[model samples]
Target chain A: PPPIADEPLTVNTGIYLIECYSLDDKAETFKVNAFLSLSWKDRRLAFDPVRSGVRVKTYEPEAIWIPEIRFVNVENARDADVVDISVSPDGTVQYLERFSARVLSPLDFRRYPFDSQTLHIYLIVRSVDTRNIVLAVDLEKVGKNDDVFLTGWDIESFTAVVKPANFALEDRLESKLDYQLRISRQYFSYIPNIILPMLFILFISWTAFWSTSYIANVTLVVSTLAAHIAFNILVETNLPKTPYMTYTGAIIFMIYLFYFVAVIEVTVQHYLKVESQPARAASITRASRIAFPVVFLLANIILAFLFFGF
Target chain B: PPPIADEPLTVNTGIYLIECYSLDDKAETFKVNAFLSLSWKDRRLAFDPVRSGVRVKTYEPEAIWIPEIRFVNVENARDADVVDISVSPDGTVQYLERFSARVLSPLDFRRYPFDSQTLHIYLIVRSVDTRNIVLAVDLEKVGKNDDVFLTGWDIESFTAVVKPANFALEDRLESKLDYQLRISRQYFSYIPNIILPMLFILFISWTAFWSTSYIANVTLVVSTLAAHIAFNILVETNLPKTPYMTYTGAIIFMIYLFYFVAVIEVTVQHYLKVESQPARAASITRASRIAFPVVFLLANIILAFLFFGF
Candidate 1:
């Protein structure tokens, strides 16, 4: 089969448009959504997501740095990381990136709470190719006294290069976006809000077991989850469509989290009543008892830290 | 450079081997094992996931038929709809897929159970090349009520052809195994046991407000959350990675849920004790409150569903 169709067709290539939104129902539009458009000599060859790869350049030093890291609150430490980069041919040296780090934990300053922490951004570059490319970087911790901190490396950028292994065809393109804090903040509000609230709802539902059923306690847990979900749907409008999981994805997991916990509550309440009398249940309902909500609640807090701590 | 380095890597042009396993500490080897394989070739190059085009295909009405329906004592009505099919490109015909209908809910024979269900599969293929190819097949469902059930589109046999499309140098691979029983069972287990238990814990911590010194209740809740974390780590190991939230995740969230409630418990407890008996405060020692154990026992039942619900 031929790469292009037989008929003559017109073709054009240029940068395209990209749009983004904010959590406050405001639009944050980018004037230049630069995409490298391709045009076949015979007009028959079209783009295929599977077969096509972009030539992307990554930073060196092996430190994983997403291009964007959105901050939702100065106080609570709610955030999500984001990145964008394009692949280029060997000739393009314009794509290298550098950055540094910092950290702001709450207890550091009792006087100025919001300005409590900082992060330094730095970068080192490495080779770009189909196989594994190792790059190394370092992170330092700084605080009023000294905050214990460590650093490592992870996949900081992703790109696909369509060029052949050998220098057969010199076709390639590399794109880069300067790290922008304004855009990061916009993306963070919608995503982390959903992420945190869903988890919060689960926490409430789980802890409800500790309180006296009094009907009031259970209702509070369920209602809180419902409100959070409503907020979740509202903010989803600001997210982007990417192949991998995004901050928005955190919420998808969270909604299910709320539902699953609720189901458990219903089943447990029903089953326990069938086996044990009201007094046994009542006797077991001690607020200070270690078993009820205390142990379970503590377990999840640790898990949450494990997942988000990095 | 060339796409293939040095020697042309021996082309392994055929179906890929798929392996499945069950991990159990008690079992000497894998308790459950299954081998599966999928083979396919595009009728044309344009049918890739990334390919852009408006495609359509027509099929013979009598070419194949879908299977009938039956119910089982399990979740997911979709399992009754599984089918097998073959796809042909050029002169080569290859076994392509085993499809089942998406099940809505697992049936419960305890209420109204049926012996079995069946399904038929169909395909609509179209492209820029040849014009029409359609096929179909059927499958039969069989299982003990409640013990097990299947969910999928059942196509016994089917044929497909690209309309105007042509198979090119590269094609995309699609594997359909995203939804499985293991995932559902995982969710089922954690939600009821872990989530419910945690909720009770939270409530108990809350009610401790009325029971005794607030400081005592807060301490108990924190300790409870810490222990719950250990249990969560154990349960998380059993389930597979799911893009969707798992029941276990919800259960784990309960721990955090209770912890959040515990924070309040601690604060209130401290404040209350501070106002009255600040210096000589006694911890709430009434462990007999049945709410703690009642909820904890209830949590165990819910947790059972998560792991054993299958």
Candidate 2:
């Protein structure tokens, strides 16, 4: 049995992020290595207030019966290492445990690369058989370490909402707190690896508008069509298909639409020239050069405006 | 000692403001601890080609000749501690000195507690005996430290006006840089400590104008007058005696005028009431209620505008 007391026990807890990584966030999870600061008062330990040079005495985690703290949103068991367990003169326990856990927080894939996410970590403590343990956030001890880094992501802030949720669940009184880790994606590779390369392929087909040979025109656009189709399928595998469209998703689909339209224009140019109407074909080709690029530029502004809302 | 050169030798200098504190501005001074980043081309130690492939070499101050840099507005000798001295293979010198110095930068007291200051630290390099040394600001290296703080003050920005002041001084060329450390007053406590507290005291004297208790009015106005008199002297001691009127100076002296007027009104009420002129005394006392509050509010707007320009 735990130390029985007249008053209910209160555990003041906080999480200090030490090392953060695993943007394997596509799997709907992120990893965190953090120091969990847990403090509670036990009247039974108040008898011994004397100590030598080291001031407060230390104890093993197994020696004390503490509240069962669980991370509600965590996927698996935490690999927790007991850092320190010290009992003060007034029987106030200061416990710190460094733990690494993969949290199953939902990330918004709506904007993908341009998106910022607030990941939630829910910490909860359930009541024992006899005593109810209340939980509170120790705001002073909650902070991200200076050396904390997430791969390919910028961590904006790590903070806990100060209020606790005290609720009865499955005949047990539990206290819960929400901690937020804000992250924004760094999409530097997206420009060079995909956007520019795709733009190069799209611009290759637009050069056909300057030529007269239908053989050259057909080959130019047909080759670009195949190139973009191959690139499109390859890039789409990197991202999961969601119901709502993303900014990059729209731009990628828009590139494929331009490729098909150029093919239709090339076929019409060949048909008109073959029908002995050189005037209409050349006039349409002249307009095609300007219309294709101008429409793409107009579409670029419209897509960015709708997605980014400015 | 400075490096020997034929044409005017230039020492590129920068001040990294570190630990900012001691705004004892009543004495017109502030203390600062900063990193003095000094660089110059010596061309003397350029060819140590051997010994385990060391790219650059470290040196002591006694081994290398460095420009003698001085502060123009400083009160006493700086407590300088040499942090580092390094020389590249091409004989370019890197000297870092972490020094603590108290600067007597003149402050404007016209706005007092609400005033912001651009504190200047003048860096000068005097020409040596053989070769002339010119001082130039390395704009990239001039910055405030991330961990810098000042008690009861909010630091805004630290930047150097890049133009070097090169002129003749005592038959030698001396160059100066104006390193401005901007600061604003932390006047959060003043609202509670003086302004609001004094306003409440004046409001008590105004409450006396509401009723016909002559004895109560006499006692009420006297105590407020005495309290404000003591408060004015106490607060004035915290500030220096500036020749021009400060924002608070007008408010303080204006408060004393209100006290004198309230005292006269109180005496006039008693004298006229004694002569069986209740109608005349009551009408004047009623006017005191609106006129006293109305004029003080008017003076508040005028004094604020006069001291703190729009």
Choose the strongest candidate by TM-score: 2
lDDT of 2 at B200: 59
Steric clash pairs (candidate 2)? none
lDDT of 1 at B224: 57
Question: What clash count does candidate 2 reach?
Answer: 0
Q: Give the per-residue lDDT digits (tens) of candidate 2, residues B1-310.
A: 4555667767777787656655776788887777677888888767574863566676779899878888898998787767557788878987877677889898887787788889988888777565444454555345675546565567899988777788889987788878889988876546534575477567756766654656656655676676677668757887887888877888999999999989888889889999999999989988987898899999888888888865
- TM-score of each model's chain B: 0.34, 0.94
- DockQ of candidate 2 is 0.00
DockQ, computed on Cα atoms, for candidate 1: 0.02
- Residue-wise lDDT of candidate 1 within B89-153, one digit each (tens)? 23112232222332222211111111111221111121111222122111111111232222221
Which run of 10 residues does model 2 chain B get worst, by summed lDDT?
B132-141
lDDT of 2: 0.74
Cα lDDT for residue B274, model 2? 94
